[PDB]
Amino acid sequence: NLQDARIIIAGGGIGGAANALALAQKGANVTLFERASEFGEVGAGLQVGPHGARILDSWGVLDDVLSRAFLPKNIVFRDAITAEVLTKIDLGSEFRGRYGGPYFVTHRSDLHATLVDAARAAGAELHTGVTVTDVITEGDKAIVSTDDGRTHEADIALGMDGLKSRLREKISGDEPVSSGYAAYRGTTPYRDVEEDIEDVVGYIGPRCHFIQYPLRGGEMLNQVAVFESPGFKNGIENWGGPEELEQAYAHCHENVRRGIDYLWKDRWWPMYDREPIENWVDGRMILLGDAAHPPLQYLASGAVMAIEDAKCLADYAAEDFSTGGNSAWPQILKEVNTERAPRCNRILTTGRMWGELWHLDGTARIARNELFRTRDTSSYKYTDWLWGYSSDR
Amino acid sequence: NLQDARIIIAGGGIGGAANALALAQKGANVTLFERASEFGEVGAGLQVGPHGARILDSWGVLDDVLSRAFLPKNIVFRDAITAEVLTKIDLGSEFRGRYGGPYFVTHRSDLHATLVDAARAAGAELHTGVTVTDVITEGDKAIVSTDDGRTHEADIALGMDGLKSRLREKISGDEPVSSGYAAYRGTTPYRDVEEDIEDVVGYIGPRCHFIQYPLRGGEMLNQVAVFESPGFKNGIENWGGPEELEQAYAHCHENVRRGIDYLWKDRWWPMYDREPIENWVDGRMILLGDAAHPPLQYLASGAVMAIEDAKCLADYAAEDFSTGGNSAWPQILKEVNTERAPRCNRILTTGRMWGELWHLDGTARIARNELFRTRDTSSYKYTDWLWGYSSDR
Numbered sequence: 001n002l003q004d005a006r007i008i009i010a011g012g013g014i015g016g017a018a019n020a021l022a023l024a025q026k027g028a029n030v031t032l033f034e035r036a037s038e039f040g041e042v043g044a045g046l047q048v049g050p051h052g053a054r055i056l057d058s059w060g061v062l063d064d065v066l067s068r069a070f071l072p073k074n075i076v077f078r079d080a081i082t083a084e085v086l087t088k089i090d091l092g093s094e095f096r097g098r099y100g101g102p103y104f105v106t107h108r109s110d111l112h113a114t115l116v117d118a119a120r121a122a123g124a125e126l127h128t129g130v131t132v133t134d135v136i137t138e139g140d141k142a143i144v145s146t147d148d149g150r151t152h153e154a155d156i157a158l159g160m161d162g163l164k165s166r167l168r169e170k171i172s173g174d175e176p177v178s179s180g181y182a183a184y185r186g187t188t189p190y191r192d193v194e195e196d197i198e199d200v201v202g203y204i205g206p207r208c209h210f211i212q213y214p215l216r217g218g219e220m221l222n223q224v225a226v227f228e229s230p231g232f233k234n235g236i237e238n239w240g241g242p243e244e245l246e247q248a249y250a251h252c253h254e255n256v257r258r259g260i261d262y263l264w265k266d267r268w269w270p271m272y273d274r275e276p277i278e279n280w281v282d283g284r285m286i287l288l289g290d291a292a293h294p295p296l297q298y299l300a301s302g303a304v305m306a307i308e309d310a311k312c313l314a315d316y317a318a319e320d321f322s323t324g325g326n327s328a329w330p331q332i333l334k335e336v337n338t339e340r341a342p343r344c345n346r347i348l349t350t351g352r353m354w355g356e357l358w359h360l361d362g363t364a365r366i367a368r369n370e371l372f373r374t375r376d377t378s379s380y381k382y383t384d385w386l387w388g389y390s391s392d393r
Numbered sequence: 394n395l396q397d398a399r400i401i402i403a404g405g406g407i408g409g410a411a412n413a414l415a416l417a418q419k420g421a422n423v424t425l426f427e428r429a430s431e432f433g434e435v436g437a438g439l440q441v442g443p444h445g446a447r448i449l450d451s452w453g454v455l456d457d458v459l460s461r462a463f464l465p466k467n468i469v470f471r472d473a474i475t476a477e478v479l480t481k482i483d484l485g486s487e488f489r490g491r492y493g494g495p496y497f498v499t500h501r502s503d504l505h506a507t508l509v510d511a512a513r514a515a516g517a518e519l520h521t522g523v524t525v526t527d528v529i530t531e532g533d534k535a536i537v538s539t540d541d542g543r544t545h546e547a548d549i550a551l552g553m554d555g556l557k558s559r560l561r562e563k564i565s566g567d568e569p570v571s572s573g574y575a576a577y578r579g580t581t582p583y584r585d586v587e588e589d590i591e592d593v594v595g596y597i598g599p600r601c602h603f604i605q606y607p608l609r610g611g612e613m614l615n616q617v618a619v620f621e622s623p624g625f626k627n628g629i630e631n632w633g634g635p636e637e638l639e640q641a642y643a644h645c646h647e648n649v650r651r652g653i654d655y656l657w658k659d660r661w662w663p664m665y666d667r668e669p670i671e672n673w674v675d676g677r678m679i680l681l682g683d684a685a686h687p688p689l690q691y692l693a694s695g696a697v698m699a700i701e702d703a704k705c706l707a708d709y710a711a712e713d714f715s716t717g718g719n720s721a722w723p724q725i726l727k728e729v730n731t732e733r734a735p736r737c738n739r740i741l742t743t744g745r746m747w748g749e750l751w752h753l754d755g756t757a758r759i760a761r762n763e764l765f766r767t768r769d770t771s772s773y774k775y776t777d778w779l780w781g782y783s784s785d786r
């Protein structure tokens with residue numbers, strides 16, 4: 001376990017919260033600093049495959065999360081022009097047996113709160129309204145600076161400050177790479193959306209897609225529209241705004257076009273990722289979550305990768321610190337980086353190809369539709385790398 | 394049959410020759426005018442699927458053509474970058490039984506000569522060095538003008554003057570549509586090409602393809618390179634010249650790049666087709682062959698469609714003229730047009746999509762390769778429309 005260990009976590013998103021939980025359950029001393037004045041997340045959906053669900057079950061929080069989640073029966077791909085069903089991924093009894101957990105969807109806000117509550121329950125010391133302004137390594141400790149003028153000593157620090165990480169600048173000078181696509185969300189009472197949906201449905205079209213799924217007990221429908229922004233190509237600084245939505249969907253089926261009207265129009269998410277990097281470690285600081293590996297969201301696995309990062313770090317640390325103490329930390333960070341970077345950088349790079357496959361047009365769309373139609377639905381070769389991974393050694 | 398019938402054919406390519414044969418075997422009086430001073434065709438390969446082979450067998454010329462042809466065992470698609478085999482179409486015993494004949498390849502010159510010799514044997518009067526300058530219909534006859542100042546009366550005329558048909562101007566003012574791709578050919582002694590080939594091999598790559606097949610007894614190898622011409626986009630009048638070949642293949646596998654060196658460089662074929670048109674009839678003149686329906690050559694069926702045109706016209710004419718005489722000709726031309734236009738215009742339009750499918754790049758290429766790999770090789774759904782058609786009623 002981790003009793004004499006001290007860890008400081010910079011950032012309290014889903015990643016930082018899950019690391020706080022996993023390390024405090026091992027008996028470590030955890031201090032987490034979150035810049036925002038309250039913990040919280042967007043009150044809209046996310047998807048959590050069995051690669052995340054199994055981990056939450058290990059931490060004893062899956063049952064609880066599921067009480068406020070929705071269990072879709074399938075992921076259904078449809079053509080966005082014709083609305084034709086192309087293929088389904090069955091999330092039923094064969095899938096859960098293979099992958100050791102359900103594929104579920106829930107509100108981001110609920111998952112994040114449940115993680116923060118369990119982290120606190122397990123002993124983690126969480127602080128809101130505090131920004132980490134620096135992390136340096138001196139001798140065998142990390143020295144962390146906060147925006148109240150204080151400094152804090154720990155054995156290691158986690159840089160979990162997101163896609164716009166400033167801690168990442170210690171290791172890499174790269175900048176976010178624009179995809180040129182923007183995401184909108186909406187959540188609507190299910191009854192007010194204009195047949196019935198019990199699945200995650202993805203309509204995939206030229207230069208756009210549109211996703212729908214129900215949330216807890218089917219009361220609300222989550223809707224997500226992602227489209228190629230002409231403003232990005234044309235050089236706009238604040239590209240992707242809502243004046244682009246009608247034109248971006250004008251070639252789609254009525255089921256998709258009607259959906260646009262339900263989206264929140266006052267906020268959107270221009271989609272960026274970063275090129276993959278191999279090394280995430282600077283002395284006794286490791287970058288994790290989106291600060292190490294921010295993806296485009298086509299594989300719905302960004303938060304799941306931050307959860308897997310938490311599991312791997314706490315499991316490999318408990319194994320090695322038990323017998324090697326504080327001196328073992330730089331070897332533990334190396335081993336965690338070596339396990340996690342190939343996994344997560346394959347999600348980054350394959351995710352980019354997978355979104356391009358959704359957004360094909362012309363003859364390439366005709367080929368992609370037939371490839372999805374004719375596949376062997378009993379084969380798991382397209383998914384085992386993603387949903388069957390485990391860091392267990 | 395056709396004994397009192399008179400037909401004049403404008404053009405003596407493979408189309409005009411095959412119509413002369415089919416009509417003279419029915420006992421019709423056939424006069425064919427060819428502009429060139431000698432009958433002849435390019436001494437390079439063509440492919441003739443069972444949709445053409447069955448027809449030649451009916452006319453009693455298949456055995457003879459086969460004596461000087463090559464019988465490939467498969468059509469093999471390979472990726473032009475990696476040389477990976479993607480899929481094979483087996484041309485063996487299941488295929489020939491299904492489609493009623495072999496898929497063969499031979500020299501264009503040999504097929505054309507064999508058709509011209511059999512047409513002559515059957516009674517057709519062939520004339521070289523004579524251009525048809527006009528065709529008009531007056532009463533119940535076609536009146537055909539030639540470039541020696543003479544006029545000729547027949548019951549019907551066939552406009553078979555090719556892709557650049559001037560007779561087509563009677564019916565449509567359209568012009569050839571450039572594909573922006575150019576074709577080169579070569580034939581090399583098989584032994585001099587730098588493993589062994591017993592199939593039709595198509596290497597399909599971004600913005601290009603490369604085809605190889607052996608000719609009679611495997612003595613010569615036919616090679617065809619088709620690539621997207623940057624000169625066409627850039628506005629050159631005589632675009633597609635050989636200075637473009639190296640760059641156009643520079644991303645391909647060595648097997649493809651080595652092939653370029655064997656091509657004839659003194660002549661090439663900029664690839665054009667025409668938009669499909671429904672009506673091919675002007676009074677007692679019908680356009681047939683490339684004058685009615687010139688394709689891009691991705692389905693290797695242009696000459697085969699002209700052969701099918703010959704079979705349909707002679708069969709439907711023999712059926713109706715037997716009992717209705719000369720007065721039946723305009724109804725016969727209508728019925729032939731109504732049978733042949735949907736068939737041939739589907740080859741035109743599907744052929745364009747099929748070449749685009751070969752020339753995909755990026756994620757669209759990854760999708761296309763997997764679609765070809767994973768297909769049901771026992772299913773004929775992609776090919777029955779093409780190789781299983783018959784005009785028989």
Ligand SMILES: Cc1cc2nc3c(=O)[nH]c(=O)nc-3n(C[C@H](O)[C@H](O)[C@H](O)COP(=O)(O)OP(=O)(O)OC[C@H]3O[C@@H](n4cnc5c(N)ncnc54)[C@H](O)[C@@H]3O)c2cc1C
Nearest residue numbers: 011013014015035047132161162289290300301302303304
């Ligand atoms: C449209 C969209 C849909 C998505 N859908 C899914 C999905 O279905 N499933 C999935 O698994 N993932 C999904 N993701 C990805 C997922 O949202 C992210 O990968 C994940 O939230 C990253 O978590 P994180 O904790 O690493 O970073 P963040 O969530 O960015 O958290 C970083 C935190 O650090 C705080 N902070 C920043 N700087 C400092 C500092 N110096 N000091 C202290 N605090 C700091 C920030 O306030 C923030 O709370 C999606 C992403 C997008 C954009």
Ligand SMILES: Cc1cc2nc3c(=O)[nH]c(=O)nc-3n(C[C@H](O)[C@H](O)[C@H](O)COP(=O)(O)OP(=O)(O)OC[C@H]3O[C@@H](n4cnc5c(N)ncnc54)[C@H](O)[C@@H]3O)c2cc1C
Nearest residue numbers: 404406407408428440525554555682683693694695696697
């Ligand atoms: C690179 C390439 C590869 C191909 N590969 C294949 C293949 O493998 N299989 C296949 O089936 N098809 C293939 N084709 C298509 C095939 O070549 C043509 O569809 C077919 O040759 C057309 O025959 P046609 O008789 O209708 O016209 P043409 O061959 O053009 O013949 C028209 C004839 O009319 C003559 N002429 C013109 N004007 C007059 C006039 N006013 N008076 C008298 N005579 C006139 C011309 O001199 C010419 O001989 C390919 C085409 C290309 C470009």
Ligand SMILES: [Cl-]
Nearest residue numbers: 297300301302
């Ligand atoms: Cl994601």
Ligand SMILES: [Cl-]
Nearest residue numbers: 690693694695
């Ligand atoms: Cl052709």
